[PDB]
Amino acid sequence: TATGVAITGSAPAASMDATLPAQLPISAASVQSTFTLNLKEIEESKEQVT
Amino acid sequence: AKLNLAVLNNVFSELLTQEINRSATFLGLLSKYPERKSNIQWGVGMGGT
């Protein structure tokens, strides 16, 4: 703050500035996927599909 | 309003002190041997003559 006193005044009241946190958490979850393909399908798809 | 009040960070120092008793005193002098066999067979000589 900045207030106005007289020239022969008496030094007005105290005031400082301020900061604040944010803390923004991330560490719980994930985005995942599976697909579970077979081992015999990867041979009968090289001479089956054009 | 205090300027760097809520933005102070705390840092733990490098002073870990282990405060338990774990010690193999009797195991530390038994003259360990390896044995890749199923069981330990030896002979014990009694009397009889």
Q: Tokens 């579970």 — which residue?
A: A36
**DSSP category for residue B29:** G
Which residues of chain A lie closer than 8 angstroms to B3, CB-CB?
16-19
- Are residues B6 and A19, on separate chains, in Cβ contact within 8 Å? yes
**DSSP category for residue B27:** G
Q: Which of A19, A20, A24 to mutate to test the interface with B (most CBs of B within 10 A)?
A: A19
Q: How was this one solved?
A: cryo-EM
Cβ-contact A14, A1 below 8 angstroms: no
Cβ-contact A21, B6 below 8 angstroms: yes
The resolution, in Å, is 3.5
Which residues of chain A lie closer than 8 angstroms to B6, CB-CB?
19-21
Cβ-contact B20, A34 below 8 angstroms: no
